[PDB]
């Protein structure tokens, strides 16, 4: 329990000092909170964080006060007695599924894992979310971009041995162009929703293709109804039907990373916790899995010659070759553990008869109205799966989060691009503009901000993550466990973090497919990149 009003007085007590009105207004907040047995969760949060912001006015009006030792002690009680909150209230979680893919076509190997948990969760309703308007930005990015390496390629020319045209600059120039088509569509596109707002987003982009890149209106029509055609069959959701996004104060943020920056990962990152706050259930990526059951490879030791994530991979790998729910699975891992494991694999799995005895079901989860939960791996946390009941706290801190970081990048960015310059000068008033408003306790996170042009066309840039990845999630975490909103410099520790973790149980992070999408534009793929790029054109 959190301590009472008397036993603070206690700790809190100096001889012969007279009990400042700011004080009594702690005690009587104490007092008050104690009366609230039966209030919802939320508001007792609240209580606790009107009671921790009475104790820091208190500390910083008496600054040498002899009250101030025993009353942080006091504040790292009313952190405990938020984690005892969270824990000893949990609410059922709304039996919905969300995924997302936008910006293009949703492949084979996507549907094949979403199929895995439809199998075996029956009971939850499932939302693959898609924008119906937008199938075509993907289009736009890959055909813009190889347009742009194509135009450098030619830029070299005969100096190819020239060692000052490196993939340094290889990749300075194709930014130049890049940003130049960029801007350019970003120009025709406002002209026609001014001109013609009836028009969406893929009428714009294809008659765009169809002038500047020669691509054929009939072929993108195409494939715009395979596309819709695809993810309706597949439990698509559409996102233009999505009122309360539509018209929140994120909605132009998706809009931004979908049609300004072809940024699909941003947007999805913006998508997913606004679908969380509103509608509740769990949030996963892809190339997530369900868990594997428990006990149905207890009588299998794991060798201490393979990690642990190698015997994940294994166990996956096993069940996809002996059951080939997924055609083509890989089998790298599996076939390199002794004749001997394998065969035990070979009759665990054999023994088995449905799906069911295989991978485990959600069922009926509960989570704290205070939280949302997160996925971790090695380095840390990771919103490939989330978990949360309708409009808990925490979403609504990391939606916060996610719109004030985006609040400050435009605040700087918009006036930068407002004058029509080509990439270097925009660069360098956006850069000008974030390093005047940097200070101490946003820091690293301008510093990152700095790449945000780049995001996606240069090695090494990491402004996705702080902008609306993991970095934002930790951020509503240290906003809740400090009752403040808008954190910037991060120092909560694993320990701290782990409070949100969602079960290992319950999702299968070690698949093939995530592997896959683990690589990094890590600046030797860069230069790799580079040479297959010169050798893929002379
Ligand atoms: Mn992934």
Not at 93 to 104: C, D, P, R, S
Not at 220 to 228: G, Q
Not at 370 to 396: H, R, T
Request: glycine content about 2%; charged content about 30%; some cysteine.
């Amino acid at each position: 329990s959190l301590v009472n009003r008397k036993q603070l007085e206690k700790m809190a007590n100096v001889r012969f000092r007279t009990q400042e009105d700011e004080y009594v207004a702690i005690l009587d907040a104490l007092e008050e909170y104690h009366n609230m047995s039966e209030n919802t969760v939320v508001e007792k949060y609240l209580k606790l964080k009107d009671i921790n912001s009475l104790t820091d006015i208190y500390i910083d009006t008496y600054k040498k006060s002899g009250r101030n030792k025993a009353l942080k002690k006091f504040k790292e009680y009313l952190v405990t007695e938020v984690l005892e909150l969270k824990n000893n209230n949990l609410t059922p979680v709304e039996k919905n599924l969300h995924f997302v893919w936008i910006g293009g076509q949703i492949n084979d190997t996507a549907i094949n894992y979403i199929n895995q948990w439809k199998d075996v969760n029956s009971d939850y309703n499932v939302n693959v979310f898609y924008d119906s308007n937008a199938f075509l930005i993907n289009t736009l990015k890959k055909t813009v971009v190889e347009s742009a390496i194509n135009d450098t390629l030619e830029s070299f020319r005969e100096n190819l041995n020239d060692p000052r045209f490196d993939y340094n600059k290889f990749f300075r120039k194709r930014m130049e162009i890049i940003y130049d088509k960029q801007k350019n569509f970003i120009n025709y596109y406002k002209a026609q929703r001014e001109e013609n707002p009836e028009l969406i987003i893929d009428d714009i982009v294809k008659t765009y293709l169809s002038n500047e890149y020669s691509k054929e209106i009939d072929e993108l029509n195409t494939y715009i109804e395979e596309s819709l055609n695809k993810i309706t069959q597949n439990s698509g959701n559409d996102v233009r039907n999505f009122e309360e996004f539509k018209n929140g104060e994120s909605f132009n943020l998706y809009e931004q990373e979908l049609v300004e920056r072809w940024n699909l990962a941003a947007a999805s990152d913006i998508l997913r916790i606004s679908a969380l706050k509103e509608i509740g259930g769990m949030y996963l990526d892809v190339d997530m899995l369900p868990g594997i059951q428990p006990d149905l490879f207890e009588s299998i030791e794991k060798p201490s010659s393979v990690t642990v994530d190698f015997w994940e991979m294994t166990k996956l790998e096993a069940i996809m070759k002996y059951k080939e729910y997924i055609p083509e699975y890989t089998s790298e891992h599996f076939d390199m553990l002794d004749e001997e494991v394998q065969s035990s694999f070979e009759s665990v799995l054999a023994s088995k008869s449905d799906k069911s005895e295989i991978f485990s079901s959600l069922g009926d989860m509960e989570a704290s109205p205070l939280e949302v939960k997160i996925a971790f791996n090695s380095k840390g946390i990771i919103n490939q799966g989330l978990i949360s009941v309708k409009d808990s706290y925490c979403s609504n801190l990391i939606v916060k989060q996610i719109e004030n970081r985006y609040k400050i990048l435009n605040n700087s960015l918009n006036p930068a691009i407002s004058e029509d310059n080509d990439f270097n000068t925009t660069t360098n008033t956006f850069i000008d503009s974030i390093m005047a408003e940097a200070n101490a306790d946003n820091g690293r996170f301008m510093m990152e901000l700095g790449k945000y042009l780049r995001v996606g066309f240069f090695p090494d840039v990491k402004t996705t993550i702080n902008l609306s990845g993991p970095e934002a999630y930790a951020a509503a975490y240290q906003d809740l466990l400090m009752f403040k909103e808008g954190s910037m410099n991060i120092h909560l520790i694993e320990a701290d973090l782990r409070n949100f973790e969602i079960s290992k149980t319950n999702i299968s992070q070690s698949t093939e497919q995530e592997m896959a999408s683990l690589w990094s534009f890590d600046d030797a793929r860069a230069k790799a990149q580079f040479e297959e790029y010169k050798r893929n054109y002379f």
